[PDB]
Design an enzyme around this catalytic site. Structure first.
Site: not given
Length: 268
Positions: A95, A217, A246
């Site tokens: 991320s 996601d 995610h």
């Protein structure tokens, strides 16, 4: 172990030249890697660390000016690598850590042989020629929910971010780590990340990148992977995984870990 290593909860497992450093995303901590690390420690020296502002870190060390852009986090990453005397690593960034690693590699490309990105995005906000997944008005409502009742926001957001069954262990874990942040830090960091724009520096990246994401996601439309691949100046490859969520390395390890391992172990 030294202030920087204590402050970021740095863990080093193994020895030798071949080194992998794993950086986590917003709202979680190094525990997000719990299903990946077992498969790395026999072949690599493995370095884990927490981003400053994670709930596992001391809020007294959270400098709102230092962390007002992603560069503050990239300076922390370089500091950790230097403190550990790491001359070269494979960097796995989940991320926001994918972009933190990219930024660090602009300043010190010599420190990275490869970046493996999981759930990365250089821009979350849509414009007329770019799909990031969010309109500004919906980000505004998100920030207001965080400000108004942080616990309530955590309980509603965690199942959406993690995906899958809303009662899963991974949803429970992410709900906990989310709420472990101090609410003012969560709000500030959430704004910094969701309003970030890394698109313009992508042509300057030179370290090869592997771009991995779940097909479903909440915060990363699949077109974002293709955008990263088209605009990064380095050699890159994309693999979209038939997974939901995610944090797929935490919530769907059986389908996700083998993909991550292939991209770590094999070059482009």
């Amino acid at each position: 172990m030294g202030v920087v290593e204590e402050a970021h909860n740095v863990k080093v497992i193994g020895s030798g030249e071949a080194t992998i450093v794993l950086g986590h995303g917003f709202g979680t901590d190094q525990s997000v890697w719990k299903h990946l690390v077992p498969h790395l420690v026999d072949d690599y020296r493995v370095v884990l660390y927490d981003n400053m502002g994670a709930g596992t870190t001391n809020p007294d060390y959270f400098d709102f000016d230092r962390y007002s852009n992603l560069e503050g986090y990239s300076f922390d990453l370089i500091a950790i690598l230097e403190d550990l005397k790491i001359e070269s690593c494979i960097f796995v960034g989940h991320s926001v850590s994918a972009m933190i690693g990219v930024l660090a590699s602009l300043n010190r490309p010599d420190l990275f042989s490869k970046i493996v990105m999981i759930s990365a995005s250089p821009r979350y906000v849509n414009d007329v020629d770019y799909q990031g997944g969010f309109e500004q008005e919906d980000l505004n409502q998100l920030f207001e929910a965080i400000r108004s009742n942080y616990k309530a926001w955590c309980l509603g957001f965690a199942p959406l971010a993690v995906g899958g069954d809303m009662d899963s262990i991974a949803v429970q874990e992410f709900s906990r780590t989310l709420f472990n942040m101090r609410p003012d830090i969560a709000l500030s960091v959430g704004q910094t990340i969701f309003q970030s724009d890394m698109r313009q520096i992508l042509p300057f990246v030179t370290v090869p990148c592997h771009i991995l994401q779940s097909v479903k996601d909440l915060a990363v439309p699949v077109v974002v992977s293709e955008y990263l691949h088209a605009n990064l100046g380095c050699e890159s490859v994309v693999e979209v995984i038939p997974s939901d969520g995610h944090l797929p390395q935490l919530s769907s390890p059986d389908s996700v870990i083998p993909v991550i391992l292939r991209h770590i172990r094999n070059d482009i």
